[PDB]
From Swiss-Prot, chain A:
Source organism phylogeny: Viruses, Riboviria, Orthornavirae, Pisuviricota, Pisoniviricetes
Task of the protein: Cleaves the C-terminus of replicase polyprotein at 11 sites. Recognizes substrates containing the core sequence [ILMVF]-Q-|-[SGACN]. Cleaves and inactivates human TRMT1, preventing tRNA guanine(26)-dimethylation of tRNAs. May cleave human NLRP1 in lung epithelial cells, thereby activating the NLRP1 inflammasome pathway. May cleave human GSDMD, triggering alternative GSDME-mediated epithelial cell death upon activation of the NLRP1 inflammasome, which may enhance the release interleukins 1B, 6, 16 and 18. Also able to bind an ADP-ribose-1''-phosphate (ADRP).
Compartmental location: Host cytoplasm; Host Golgi apparatus; Host nucleus
Recorded superkingdom: Viruses
Covalent link Glycyl lysine isopeptide (Lys-Gly) (interchain with G-Cter in ubiquitin), residues: 2, 87
Catalytic activity: TSAVLQ-|-SGFRK-NH2 and SGVTFQ-|-GKFKK the two peptides corresponding to the two self-cleavage sites of the SARS 3C-like proteinase are the two most reactive peptide substrates. The enzyme exhibits a strong preference for substrates containing Gln at P1 position and Leu at P2 position
Residue ranges, Cytoplasmic side: 1-297
Name of the gene encoding the protein in the UniProt record: rep
Annotated protein name in UniProt: 3C-like proteinase nsp5
Regulation: Inhibited by pyridone-containing alpha-ketoamides compounds 13a and 13b. In turn, alpha-ketoamide 13b (tert-butyl (1-((S)-1-(((S)-4-(benzylamino)-3,4-dioxo-1-((S)-2-oxopyrrolidin-3-yl)butan-2-yl)amino)-3-cyclopropyl-1-oxopropan-2-yl)-2-oxo-1,2-dihydropyridin-3-yl)carbamate) inhibits SARS-CoV-2 replication in human lung cells. Inhibited ex vivo by michael acceptor inhibitor N3. Inhibited ex vivo by compound 11a and 11b.
Length: 297, 298
């Protein structure tokens, strides 16, 4: 089961940011609201926005920030990469303990999808190897954030900016740097070739075993390098030794050597699933990390 | 299409732990009442075939430890309603949302906030199967975790977790303590009915496919509801109810495809199969998205 982190600590930070006829979401932490800088653009502006130029021509009072029914007065503004930072005259008493992190491709996070500053849904995503995310984001979702929670600490890793023509999504870290080769401009952008997150597929196969499901297992084995030759042929990421290490706990728990599960996955890549399904899926799933699997088994 | 859960914060603000002796589970604190599974009053050997009424007569208010985090909530009354305990406490929860208690129908989906020792671990979307089980992620200590939907700002609580079945699926009650399906809160081996496919949700999925321009499977014909139901059961599909036809109304209006015409298309898919084709990029028909879910994501 794909499980998201409880979203309450993040819900308490979501606000609405408006500039002109453009409205999206902001993240209110202490006395600063973070949001995508393209809020300052109009229709025309978005095709090729000179953001430093557009920003210098804005005043604080052109930014309407609403926390529910309350307006928050903007007393200062600055831009860090693709994120706008609006200083407000009120501190958010619901600010959690937090940090800003930049996540690695293959890592997972929860997304709190919001519209008009109001939380609407929560779901689990992975940072794809090509630095897209297979999100569910509609008009007005920009400024929705992604996060992980460790203890009481929220690690914010993603802020939402755009959708690509293939229907996947792109955004930045909370420092405003995009994941991937994308730009916050209204143009058709393609991503690099995506690949499948191999260490996560292996984790999920282990999960299917832990769940008493093992039709895909076999007696064969493989070396790491020979597995990786086949993996790359099928646009799977190569498996590193640290990935093998990371899979130990699941390996121990099932008594199945990592490289034995690699030999099972190799057979699936070459033969297909021949109708059969694994944990309900006709497709090999690659958006559970080993941690995700462990913490839920 | 993703399994998307509701934001969990309004429910997180209601979770507590309830302990009797060394047995700890979760409870739901709304206004000045805490709701939890009655089997908190059981020891190990009580769970085999508990006499709940005789177990409760021995208990007093001061035997219940209710905690929000580490802070004790004093219990000032107790009673049993079906399979839930209602513990009256001396503090009204200041985080109580607007809420309702609803009893859902099979096929309906809801979010579960999986909790341990009163602390949330994760949130996910569940569907009530036609055999009144859910495929959860519930570990020891998860009992009392709740399922819910959020409409406007109103939380509709529909599920409270009580047990696991020998096949690994899960069973529980509504917030009035009435089990979904033919299960009892005893630690005995109980079997669920053979499960079936949630027809109304498949139809919702086919409407979703049409909304996104994937409509090769629409045929020129229609059917009666009875004829469809008799065929559907031969494929281990749930028969449709009138309420099912009704909740497909909005998607039928959005697409202009009458419900019974879509039923005719599905019947053809069942009888002829997919013939190598895909719908929304899958050869499998999805049955855990409700008509409401589809609309929320389109
Ligand atoms: C901010 O809320 C918004 C979020 C977008 C809106 C729709 N889904 C989203 O994630 N972001 C923006 O509007 C971007 C602003 C720029 C200044 C960066 N622009 C875009 O995201 O580009 C448009 C979305 C787009 C529309 C058409 N098309 C499409 O229909 O795709 C399929 C897969 C549905 C056919 C591609 C995506 C271009």
């Amino acid at each position: 089961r794909k499980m998201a982190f409880p979203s309450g600590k993040v819900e308490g930070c979501m606000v609405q940011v408006t500039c002109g006829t453009t409205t999206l979401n902001g993240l209110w932490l202490d006395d600063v609201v973070y949001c995508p800088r393209h809020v300052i653009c109009t229709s025309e502006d978005m095709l090729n926005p000179n953001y430093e130029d557009l920003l210098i021509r804005k005043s604080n009072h052109n930014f309407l920030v609403q926390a529910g029914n309350v307006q928050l007065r903007v007393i200062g503004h600055s831009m860090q990469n693709c994120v706008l930072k609006l200083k407000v005259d009120t501190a958010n008493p619901k600010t959690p303990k937090y940090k800003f992190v930049r996540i690695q491709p293959g890592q997972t996070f929860s997304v709190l999808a919001c519209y008009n500053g109001s939380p609407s849904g929560v779901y689990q995503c992975a940072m794809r190897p090509n630095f897209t995310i297979k999100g569910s984001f509609l008009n007005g979702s920009c400024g929705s954030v992604g996060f992980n929670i460790d203890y009481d600490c929220v690690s914010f890793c993603y802020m939402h900016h755009m959708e690509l023509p293939t229907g996947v999504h792109a955004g930045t870290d909370l420092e405003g740097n995009f994941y991937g080769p994308f730009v916050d401009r209204q143009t058709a952008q393609a991503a690099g070739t995506d690949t499948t997150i191999t260490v996560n597929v292996l984790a999920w196969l282990y999960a299917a075993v832990i769940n008493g499901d093992r039709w895909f297992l076999n007696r064969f084995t493989t070396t790491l390098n020979d597995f990786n030759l086949v993996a790359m042929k099928y646009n799977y990421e190569p498996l590193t030794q640290d990935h093998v290490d990371i899979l130990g706990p699941l390996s121990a728990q099932t008594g199945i050597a990592v490289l034995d599960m690699c030999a099972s996955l190799k057979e699936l890549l070459q033969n297909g699933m021949n109708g059969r399904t694994i944990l309900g899926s006709a497709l090999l799933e690659d958006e559970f990390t080993p941690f995700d699997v462990v913490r839920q088994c």
